Amino acid sequence: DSVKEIVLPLFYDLLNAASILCPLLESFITFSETELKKITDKTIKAFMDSTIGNSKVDMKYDIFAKFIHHIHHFEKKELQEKFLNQIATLKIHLKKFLQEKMDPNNSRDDYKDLTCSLYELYINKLTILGRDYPIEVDEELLQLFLNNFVSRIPIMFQDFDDSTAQEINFKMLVLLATWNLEKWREIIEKVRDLRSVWKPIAAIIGRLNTLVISLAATNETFENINSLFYLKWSACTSLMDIIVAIKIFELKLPADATTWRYSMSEQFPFYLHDNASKVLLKIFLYLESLFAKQVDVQLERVADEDANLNDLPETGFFENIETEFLLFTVKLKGLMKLNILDERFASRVALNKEKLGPLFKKIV
Amino acid sequence: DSVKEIVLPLFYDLLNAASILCPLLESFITFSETELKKITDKTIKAFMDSTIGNSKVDMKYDIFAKFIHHIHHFEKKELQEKFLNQIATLKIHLKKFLQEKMDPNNSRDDYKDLTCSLYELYINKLTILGRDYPIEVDEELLQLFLNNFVSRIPIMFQDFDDSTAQEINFKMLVLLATWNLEKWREIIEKVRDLRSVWKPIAAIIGRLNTLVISLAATNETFENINSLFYLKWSACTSLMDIIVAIKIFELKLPADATTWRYSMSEQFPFYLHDNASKVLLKIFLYLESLFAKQVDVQLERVADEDANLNDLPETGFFENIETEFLLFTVKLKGLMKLNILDERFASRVALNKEKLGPLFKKIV
């Protein structure tokens, strides 16, 4: 029921936010299928016309996310087609932006403003759409994103402030990989029976491994430390999510897909590089310490842990530290159970299991 | 996709609330269509075992609300039947509750604890279910609720604390009335072309007018004033929502539906009693003055207006006053456009329209 499930919730979201989307709210405040087409068109136009920040900072992100989600569930052919049109447009514009504005030959130095535009105009919008709609990107575009942006974060990073770092995340890469696995699942389930099937996913995992490793080699300062740990965590989390996905995809392959299973070990010599694994543990340790400070618990530590960790600075980047610490632990448990992590890593995770509450204890 | 739309969101919601719902999260912390009916059974069990408070105070309310919503949208016949059984069961136990514990013949005096049980065990859960599932109640149950609880709030009111007041709402009544209109609308629509079809809707509107009037006659104290205005606001908003729903049903009748148009004029003498309309205006006035304090403007008033409005205590009942004020006004504009409110009321609503920021001005 479009009025109960789409139009009214939008109207209430807008009303609550106002106390770009003014002409939308303005429109509702007059009047008294052809109708729905016109509200949806106006809303889609605001979405495409706006800059959308990180949800922690911009109420527009969740307003559009909920609306697009409800539209999707309404399952009306003409509306699905409109959103697929928008995803196509966003990718055309993103490709141009990366080629021109983030060209490594460019002398322009303004990494903080470029990174902001990248996310506010393109990456946040496609990340919202890709929750419900399939998103796919050609090799050219994926390569531009990985080379012109992702690989360059650690040199751009000296220019960032905290709110720019906060915008950066890699959920779009996770989404791209999970939709790609999903396309293959169908082909493999109902093909049954190859050189570069894995190329885009292997490119993404390859790049996240290297980014994690380079961020760890960046010098920590009082000024950059919170944002640097946020970026590490962000890249570690997305990398974990992609590994788990691929691994699970693999477990859901039929016994007679033996060519498929071979091509994966052929094309993924590792999922997690050992040096990236070191940074995973460091981030587990960071969140452990933040969580412990929060609950006034004194942690045990193996001899050689960063003494940074004993009085970390306070951080605006993690608002629910418990959820995040727990969420990160649960993902590390995934990897343990798939044998991606070394037993030494398993031991350290469990070291403080008596001290951090009964939920953490159960997880381990 | 059940795991993507139902199971994972439930797991994350639990996880995030954990930082009687332990045994659910615990199941998730262990393992890796038959499984879905099973999770639905375990979650229904927890839902039925729990006491569910007001959403601002109890995280279980939104947790179960979202799970139930996702289950309904999945539209599997066997899952729908589980929730219809739960609705039938709640109704039976609510009828028993009202007969036994809230019988006016009863010597028990503990109305605050009884009203809490009423909402925590029965009313909150049927309200959650009624968002997606048709809730309908027979005459006996409706009369028990209206006689044994609703019409008695003004005398129970002296025993209440703030957290008990905050728990009372009349949403289930609005939902009862709107499901009833949906049912007529469908029949009118599919069949085409009445002596007591309006009886339950009329009973509800009947009772909400009397309650609003009775609450207005209740003596205010420094102690009870926040909770009193809250109950009055709560009854007024439920009443306005029902009136608007009925009016919209009327307006949507086919012009050859003469027997239908006649039955509404004839079984609805009035929608809003004059004495109840006085209370609507007092509540607009209350919300207007809370908003004005918030923004530090001095309001213009009518010559005889209650100066008390100038010196209102702060309230925890409305922690987004601006939105609440704007929402109440939107509903008033609706009743104005249906010709339920008179020019005096309309003039007063507009009095301070130059002073309360651009959105109120635009609405007015």
Residue numbers in the entry:
A (entry chain A), B (entry chain B): 674 to 692, 698 to 710, 720 to 880, 889 to 1059
Study authors write:
Sister chromatid cohesion involves entrapment of sister DNAs by a cohesin ring created through association of a kleisin subunit (Scc1) with ATPase heads of Smc1/Smc3 heterodimers. Cohesin’s association with chromatin involves subunits recruited by Scc1: Wapl, Pds5, and Scc3/SA, in addition to Scc2/4 loading complex. Because all eukaryotic genomes encode orthologs, Scc3 is the most important of cohesin’s regulatory subunits. It has roles in loading of cohesin onto chromosomes as well as its subsequent release.
However, this only yielded poorly diffracting crystals with a large unit cell. Despite many attempts, we were unable to obtain co-crystals suitable for structure determination, with S. cerevisiae or Z. rouxii proteins. Though S. cerevisiae Scc3 packed tightly as dimers in the crystals, those from Z. rouxii crystallized as monomers. Because abrogation of release is the sole essential function of Eco1, the acetyl transferase can be bypassed by mutations that reduce releasing activity. These include (spontaneous) point mutations in Wapl, Smc3, Pds5, and Scc3. Thus, Scc3D189E and E202K are in juxtaposed α-helices at the N-terminus while R996S is situated in a loop closely juxtaposed to the penultimate α-helix containing R1043L.
